[PDB]
Amino acid sequence: MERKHHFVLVHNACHGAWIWYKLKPLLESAGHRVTAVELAASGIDPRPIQAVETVDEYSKPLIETLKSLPENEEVILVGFSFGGINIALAADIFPAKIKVLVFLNAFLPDTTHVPSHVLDKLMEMFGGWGDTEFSSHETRNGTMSLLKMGPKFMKARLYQNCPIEDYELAKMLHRQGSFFTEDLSKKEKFSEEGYGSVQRVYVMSSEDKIIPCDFIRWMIDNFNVSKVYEIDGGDHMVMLSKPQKLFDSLSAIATDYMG
Amino acid sequence: MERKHHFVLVHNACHGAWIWYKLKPLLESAGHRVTAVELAASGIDPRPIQAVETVDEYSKPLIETLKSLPENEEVILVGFSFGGINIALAADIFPAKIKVLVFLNAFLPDTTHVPSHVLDKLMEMFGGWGDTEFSSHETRNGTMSLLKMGPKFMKARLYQNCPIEDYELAKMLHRQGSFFTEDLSKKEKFSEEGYGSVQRVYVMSSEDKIIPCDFIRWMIDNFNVSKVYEIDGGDHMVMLSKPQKLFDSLSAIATDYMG
Ligand SMILES: O=Cc1ccccc1
Ligand SMILES: O=Cc1ccccc1
Ligand SMILES: [Cl-]
Ligand SMILES: [Cl-]
Numbered sequence: 001m002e003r004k005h006h007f008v009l010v011h012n013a014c015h016g017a018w019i020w021y022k023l024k025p026l027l028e029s030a031g032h033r034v035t036a037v038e039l040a041a042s043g044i045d046p047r048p049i050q051a052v053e054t055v056d057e058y059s060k061p062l063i064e065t066l067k068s069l070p071e072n073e074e075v076i077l078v079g080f081s082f083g084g085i086n087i088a089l090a091a092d093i094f095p096a097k098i099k100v101l102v103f104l105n106a107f108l109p110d111t112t113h114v115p116s117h118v119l120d121k122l123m124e125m126f127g128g129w130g131d132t133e134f135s136s137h138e139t140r141n142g143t144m145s146l147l148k149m150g151p152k153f154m155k156a157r158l159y160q161n162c163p164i165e166d167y168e169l170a171k172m173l174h175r176q177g178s179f180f181t182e183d184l185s186k187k188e189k190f191s192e193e194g195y196g197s198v199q200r201v202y203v204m205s206s207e208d209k210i211i212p213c214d215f216i217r218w219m220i221d222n223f224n225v226s227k228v229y230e231i232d233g234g235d236h237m238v239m240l241s242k243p244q245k246l247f248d249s250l251s252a253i254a255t256d257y258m259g
Numbered sequence: 260m261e262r263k264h265h266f267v268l269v270h271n272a273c274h275g276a277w278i279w280y281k282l283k284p285l286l287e288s289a290g291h292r293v294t295a296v297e298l299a300a301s302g303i304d305p306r307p308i309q310a311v312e313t314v315d316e317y318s319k320p321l322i323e324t325l326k327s328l329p330e331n332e333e334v335i336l337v338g339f340s341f342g343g344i345n346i347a348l349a350a351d352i353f354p355a356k357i358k359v360l361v362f363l364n365a366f367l368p369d370t371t372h373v374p375s376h377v378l379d380k381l382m383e384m385f386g387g388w389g390d391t392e393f394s395s396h397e398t399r400n401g402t403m404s405l406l407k408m409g410p411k412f413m414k415a416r417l418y419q420n421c422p423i424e425d426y427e428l429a430k431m432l433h434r435q436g437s438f439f440t441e442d443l444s445k446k447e448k449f450s451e452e453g454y455g456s457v458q459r460v461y462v463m464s465s466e467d468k469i470i471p472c473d474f475i476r477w478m479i480d481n482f483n484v485s486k487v488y489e490i491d492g493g494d495h496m497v498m499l500s501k502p503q504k505l506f507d508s509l510s511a512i513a514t515d516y517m518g
Contacts (some may be wrong), residue, residue: 017431018277021424043432044434048299165284168280172277174299175303235442
């Protein structure tokens with residue numbers, strides 16, 4: 001049989017490691033290892049997002065996961081939505097630990113503009129926040145912008161193709177979060193020698209109603225990838241609406257980086 | 260159309276509102292209203308269990324839920340496992356807001372012994388805790404016995420008939436909890452005028468490896484219920500392994516307490 005891989009899965013803002021509950025057993029049934037990280041102030045972490053003030057603090061559990069890998073192990077690192085930013089931060093630290101970066105319906109930052117660039121572009125473009133609640137919290141180093149999705153927003157823009165149970169589950173577990181836009185604006189550019197040296201691919205859902213198909217080409221035009229995979233019928237929450245097709249895409253990717 | 264009901268669902272220790280993610284849409288599709296309470300330090304509740312030092316504090320979000328209901332509304336109150344204790348505490352405060360208590364694979368306390376009596380009785384003969392981690396936390400209320408389920412124990416004794424996806428979900432969401440057995444053993448006995456006045460039924464799973472049949476019969480013999488319903492093939496986590504059959508049970512209870 002084929003050599004199997006270790007997939008490290010990184011969830012999106014306002015969510016947690018739970019989002020991967022359908023995909024993880026699919027990958028593990030095929031022989032692969034899976035670590036679903038839980039970011040700071042996310043999921044069941046009993047720390048509020050207000051206490052996490054920086055994207056580096058947010059991302060620490062991911063950093064710790066990579067640091068703990070044995071010597072010479074490499075992983076397929078999958079970042080979902082805001083998780084794109086977390087995986088890029090990690091790739092700037094431990095590029096040699098990452099076989100390939102999988103940007104799943106994700107923000108794909110570049111190594112030219114300030115790290116908030118793609119997030120600022122999406123906020124300018126996006127008009128469907130609906131009943132999302134936006135708020136601020138003042139820290140000793142400035143304003144931190146926060147968000148809590150509304151349930152109408154969730155249903156229309158993230159989960160519209162998911163089973164109703166998955167939506168009910170998300171209603172019971174989503175949390176106030178942040179895209180750390182101010183912090184990321186002040187941070188040093190991602191580097192060519194770290195993040196830009198790592199192999200990367202894009203996996204997009206054909207019915208993503210938060211990260212539109214054109215915005216994805218714009219990002220990939222600003223910063224190219226080796227390959228784009230498309231999941232037919234996926235909503236944004238594609239590991240919930242089309243977990244078997246996502247498994248297919250990640251199995252194709254693993255075959256492409258035969259490790 | 261038969262008139263519908265408002266179900267209030269109360270989860271077990273070390274879990275949270277999320278466990279009802281399958282049952283809740285089934286009930287709502289049939290026309291009912293459902294409120295899935297998140298107890299203190301449970302699920303995404305921002306407190307650790309160390310900050311929740313008494314069972315009254317633990318139960319506060321259920322008490323608040325009942326307190327907030329409009330005048331003369333009555334609910335079907337469903338307590339799962341340690342949630343039998345919470346719903347009894349609630350019934351002793353707002354008996355007139357409860358149409359019927361539903362003890363689902365639950366501790367059924369009485370009005371003769373201390374409120375810890377049925378827990379103490381199970382704990383003495385419980386069988387293996389496996390890889391469950393026990394710890395203590397000293398407080399101004401005395402010493403709290405904490406536990407955190409281990410994953411082998413969950414698989415073997417709670418989730419054995421559940422889809423692998425639900426088991427993985429639970430691994431990503433379960434938390435350190437407590438059964439508050441010290442606090443319960445010093446609380447005043449549940450009252451005959453409050454708790455004892457409220458209609459009750461018991462719903463049991465046939466394959467619950469935590470709360471076995473003979474123990475349930477002993478509890479009911481100490482404290483009678485109006486009717487018993489059995490879910491054939493259910494594990495302890497019956498909302499996850501047989502949610503349709505749990506729906507059918509609750510639906511039958513709702514027809515029995517019509518009007
Ligand atoms: O995809 C993640 C996300 C989170 C909060 C709001 C919008 C999108
Ligand atoms: O039913 C809930 C429960 C939780 C921890 C251990 C045993 C049972
Ligand atoms: Cl996100
Ligand atoms: Cl319990």
